[PDB]
Amino acid sequence: FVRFNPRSDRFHTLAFHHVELWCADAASAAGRFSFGLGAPLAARSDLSTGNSAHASLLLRSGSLSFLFTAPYAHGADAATAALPSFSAAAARRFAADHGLAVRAVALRVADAEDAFRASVAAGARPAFGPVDLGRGFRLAEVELYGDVVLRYVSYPDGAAGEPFLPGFEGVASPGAADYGLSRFDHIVGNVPELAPAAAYFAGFTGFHEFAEFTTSGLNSMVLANNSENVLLPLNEPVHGTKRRSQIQTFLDHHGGPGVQHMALASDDVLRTLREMQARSAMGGFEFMAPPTSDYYDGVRRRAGDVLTEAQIKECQELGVLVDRDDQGVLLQIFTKPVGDRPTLFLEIIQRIGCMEKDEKGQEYQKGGCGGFGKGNFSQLFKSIEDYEKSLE
Amino acid sequence: RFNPRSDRFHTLAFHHVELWCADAASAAGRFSFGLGAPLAARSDLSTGNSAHASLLLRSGSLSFLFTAPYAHGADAATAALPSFSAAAARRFAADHGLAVRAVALRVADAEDAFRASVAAGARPAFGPVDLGRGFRLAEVELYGDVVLRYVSYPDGAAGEPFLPGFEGVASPGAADYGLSRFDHIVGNVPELAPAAAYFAGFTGFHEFAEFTTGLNSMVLANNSENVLLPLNEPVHGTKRRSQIQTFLDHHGGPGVQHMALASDDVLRTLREMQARSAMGGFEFMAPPTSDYYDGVRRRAGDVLTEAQIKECQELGVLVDRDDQGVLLQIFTKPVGDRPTLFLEIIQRIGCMEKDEKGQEYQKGGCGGFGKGNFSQLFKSIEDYEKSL
Ligand SMILES: [Fe+2]
Ligand SMILES: [Fe+2]
């Protein structure tokens, strides 16, 4: 149901800006994600650019921005880091600690200095004080959950032509094309306990609850900004049970709280999935086994009035799950872990519905249109369990 | 000129090369796509291995293993590679970043290779052990934190994925780009003489070639000479900082500088590889300017056609020759973040010594190592700095 929205953000939160993974080797991670996701390299900051502290590669597709960063070892001169908050020692420990993982969830805000200030005044634990990067660009960080930080980035609307962040050199893509992913939809974190994680996070941002799924194996709650275009869910495990909670399994292998999955939206998910799946065999990402025709007979009954046989067929061929909503239709699919451990994975989706306008010809879509796959949980759990037992 | 055939143990050929990292999935995936080597075997949590995640890529006879250690809830006993040590691997990655940890050769008897090696000076790294099904493994120190690994197994075991404990992975939707075998693997050390004395000393590998130019080099080889393992040391002086020292500096010690991978049709191979550079594959050294190709016409116009020279020029491949042999070669830019490890793609033309029946055995090293191209090499990187 639609939960009330008290529009209580403590600072103006515009939208997701980017995500940064602190890696063992940026070249490797960025390189694989670039062809695996169809996100050409767009900016860079490394030795070739005068940064001898860290190597950073920014991949982009539509409005999706993925930053991959790794520390140099010797001859490293910290003062040359394009990202002032970088810590070689911290990064090195991060990589050994979790393998491939998300370090920063960055949101564009009206003013990074005021967002930090209002955040710390409301309990946020500071991670990196506000600094100017140049051209009206500001950055600040506070602790989100575990060793993941919530990063604030602000700049004049007129500076949006910047490749990424000051200090980053733009990279052109002439012999390059994307697969259709356009934006981050939601970023989910796993914590040992929801309430305290939620109280701290909602308490310093003013973000409100948009949705919740409670019980197997987990309790989830989605937090959103005023306009609800920024969605940050949190999961906690449910103890006891039969098999170990999939949430606990992550905390165990990951070694603590962290980003579990990131949902990436496409406006034509079928075209996008075909491109990704064509790359699976040679280093790309793999997807969860497609459900069986029974599941799909069910989608014909559940939503045969929005998808066409040739579409539902495509869905079954790729392994896409389909959910219906009081006001929208959701197509979603999950990849297998993108790193060495069964921790971080990706979700690819497309939302159908909830379109409206704002005195302009551009028709915007309501955030979270179609839900989060509540109807598919049953199947998702069965696919996960089966694969689990399959791993014995 | 003289092959003393002094091997202290039976060295059959290159078996695989293992790179250690904190993140093997990323490295393996990028390399798979960049080299055209589909996944052929794995050993990890999904196979009962909670100590390390290992991925084996393969193209023809080339085998690349990528390994990273698990951090929490790990059982060391479950390692498929008994020599693996989590703490040593973590330290290795923080020290060198993405790099080659092991150069593995297939030998007659791994135990015999080890015993014969330490009997002659080798620093032991891991004692011989039986992995099961006739498979044996041992390791000794090569240079720095890189080890020379020995594996052995009966010709009937060849019917298995990799080493016991590794699960085979089928690649129905996967095709390679023509890379078929390792040609040579080069290590950089601070001082050549002692390192080469040590290395040639415990293996019995003889000196195949030598280049005394800012670096000096010796190429050691096994009896059949199908295993070539060169060494470089930097020569200090003049102005420019030795590219060999740059490696040592950024890498933090001795280590593998480059691996030359051979293809039977390198032009065909390079087109596939270069078509993927823009999307995460590997980048190469910018092509030499046309005057260089005016040069290969002059120097190899008798063995290569105009169409073939232009193809080389489009791809940026360098050409060189010796007596009875032609070498085609190209260098990629660093494969990881640090200006250290890189790859060399080549094809050797000639030295097809046979008894009139058909192509079956080419002498190793046919065409040299690119001596005639060093000057273009110095110029290509100079053109990089002189283009910030
Ligand atoms: Fe999701
Ligand atoms: Fe070479």
Q: Which two tokens stand for residue A50?
A: 């005068």
Given a contact cutoff of 8 angstroms between Cβ atoms, the answer to whether A331 and A312 are in contact is no
Check CB contact of A281 with chain B, cutoff 8 Å. Answer: yes
Question: Which residue, among A30, A100, A36, A27, has the nearest Cα to A282 in the 3D structure?
Answer: A36
Pairing of strands A54-61, A137-145: unpaired
Give A203's DSSP letter: H
CATH topology of domain B1-176: 2,3-Dihydroxybiphenyl 1,2-Dioxygenase; domain 1 (3.10.180)
Q: What are phi and psi of B248, to 5 degrees?
A: -50, -40
Given a contact cutoff of 8 angstroms between Cβ atoms, the answer to whether B228 and B364 are in contact is yes
What are B19's strand-pairing partners?
A: B66, B100
Partner-chain contact B33 A29, CB within 8 Å: no
How far is it, in rounded angstroms, from Cα A175 to Cα A378? 43
What stretch of H or E contains B218?
Answer: strand B215-221
Question: Which residues, in sequence order, are CB contacts of B176 under 8 Å at separation 6+?
Answer: B36, B37, B38, B59, B60
Residue ranges with CB less than 5 Å from ion ligand 1: A 263, 347
Question: B76 to chain A nearest CA, in Å?
Answer: 15
Question: How was this entry determined?
Answer: X-ray
Given a contact cutoff of 8 angstroms between Cβ atoms, the answer to whether B47 and B165 are in contact is yes
Structure-token match 């930080």, residue found: A149
Longest CA pairwise span in chain A (Å): 63
Residue ranges with CB less than 5 Å from ion ligand 2: B 260, 344
How far is it, in rounded angstroms, from Cα B147 to Cα A329? 56
∠ CA A38-A43-A44, nearest 5°, is 115
Which residues 10-39 of chain B have a CB within 8 Å of chain A?
21-34, 36, 38
- Displacement of CA B357 from its chain's centroid (Å): 31
How far is it, in rounded angstroms, from Cα A75 to Cα B66? 27
What are A102's strand-pairing partners?
A: A21
Whether A1-178 shares its CATH topology with A179-392 is answered yes
Superfamily of structural domain A179-392: 2,3-Dihydroxybiphenyl 1,2-Dioxygenase, domain 1 (3.10.180.10)
How many beta-carbon contacts under 8 Å exist across A and B? 157
Provide the 10 A C-beta neighbour count for residue B58: 23
Distance A153 CA to ligand 1 centre (A): 24
How far is it, in rounded angstroms, from Cα A136 to Cα A142? 20
Question: Which residue, among B376, B96, B377, has the nearest Cα to B243 in the 3D structure?
Answer: B377
Helix axes A88-98, B86-96, angle to 10 degrees: 140
Given a contact cutoff of 8 angstroms between Cβ atoms, the answer to whether A34 and A26 are in contact is no
Structure-token match 């103890």, residue found: A239
Domain locations in chain B? 1-176, 177-388
CATH architecture entry for B177-388: Roll (3.10)
Q: Which of A28, A41, A181 is the mutation pick for testing B, counting most B CBs within 10 A?
A: A28
Given a contact cutoff of 8 angstroms between Cβ atoms, the answer to whether A44 and A162 are in contact is no
Give A374's DSSP letter: G
What stretch of H or E contains A143?
Answer: strand A137-145
What are B318's strand-pairing partners?
A: B329
Given a contact cutoff of 8 angstroms between Cβ atoms, the answer to whether B316 and B287 are in contact is yes
CB nearest B68 (choices: A97, A99, A279): A99
Question: A262 to chain B nearest CA, in Å?
Answer: 17
Residue of A nearest to B38 (CA): A282
- Displacement of CA B282 from its chain's centroid (Å): 16
Q: Where are the beta strands (DSSP E) in A191-230?
A: 208-213, 218-224
Contacts of B98 in chain A (CB under 8 A): 24-25, 27-28
How far is it, in rounded angstroms, from Cα A252 to Cα B9? 46
How far is it, in rounded angstroms, from Cα A183 to Cα A175? 22
Partner-chain contact B280 A33, CB within 8 Å: yes
Partner-chain contact B29 A40, CB within 8 Å: no
How far is it, in rounded angstroms, from Cα A207 to Cα A198? 10
Question: A202 to chain B nearest CA, in Å?
Answer: 30
Given a contact cutoff of 8 angstroms between Cβ atoms, the answer to whether B354 and B343 are in contact is no
Q: Which two tokens stand for residue B164?
A: 């016991």
The alpha helices in B69-173, defined as continuous H runs, are: 86-96, 110-118
The 3-class SS string of A266-296 reads: ECCHHHHHHHHHHHHHHCCCCECCCCCHHHH
Given a contact cutoff of 8 angstroms between Cβ atoms, the answer to whether A340 and A254 are in contact is no
- Displacement of CA B302 from its chain's centroid (Å): 31
Contacts of B97 in chain A (CB under 8 A): 24-25, 70, 73
How far is it, in rounded angstroms, from Cα A105 to Cα B81? 37
Structure-token match 């070669």, residue found: B329
- The experimental resolution of this structure, in angstroms, equals 2.0
Q: Is A77 exposed, middle or buried (0-12, 13-18, 19+ CB in 10 A)?
A: exposed
How far is it, in rounded angstroms, from Cα B81 to Cα B47? 13
Pairing of strands B206-212, B135-143: unpaired
- Alpha-carbon distances, residue A374 vs A129, A213, A244, B264 (angstroms): 39, 8, 20, 54
Given a contact cutoff of 8 angstroms between Cβ atoms, the answer to whether A59 and A176 are in contact is no
CATH architecture entry for A1-178: Roll (3.10)
Given a contact cutoff of 8 angstroms between Cβ atoms, the answer to whether A263 and A186 are in contact is yes
Give just the sign of the alpha carbon dihedral A95, A100, A105, A108: positive
How far is it, in rounded angstroms, from Cα B212 to Cα A215? 73
Residue of B nearest to A48 (CA): B388
Residue of B nearest to A338 (CA): B25
Q: Which two tokens stand for residue B150?
A: 């020995």
* DSSP per position, B275-319: TSGGGTS--BPPPPPHHHHHHHHHHHTTTS-HHHHHHHHHHT-EE
Question: Which residue, among A25, A7, A187, A206, has the nearest Cα to A106 in the 3D structure?
Answer: A187
Structure-token match 């015993």, residue found: B115
Q: Which two tokens stand for residue B170?
A: 């089928």
Question: Which residue, among A227, A222, A195, A196, has the nearest Cα to A209 in the 3D structure?
Answer: A222
How far is it, in rounded angstroms, from Cα B346 to Cα A9? 60
Q: Is B312 exposed, middle or buried (0-12, 13-18, 19+ CB in 10 A)?
A: buried
Structure-token match 């949101």, residue found: A107
Question: A172 to chain B nearest CA, in Å?
Answer: 10
- Displacement of CA A322 from its chain's centroid (Å): 20
Radius of gyration (C-alpha) of chain B in whole angstroms? 21
Structure-token match 């590669």, residue found: A57
What stretch of H or E contains B53?
Answer: strand B52-59
Question: Which residue, among B239, B177, B242, B179, has the nearest Cα to B216 in the 3D structure?
Answer: B242
Q: Which two tokens stand for residue B199?
A: 């290395």
How far is it, in rounded angstroms, from Cα B349 to Cα A348? 48
Partner-chain contact B38 A281, CB within 8 Å: yes
How far is it, in rounded angstroms, from Cα A364 to Cα A370? 15
At position B94, the amino acid (one-letter code) is A
C-alpha distance across the termini of chain A, in Å? 38
At position A138, the amino acid (one-letter code) is R
Q: Which two tokens stand for residue B84?
A: 């693996």
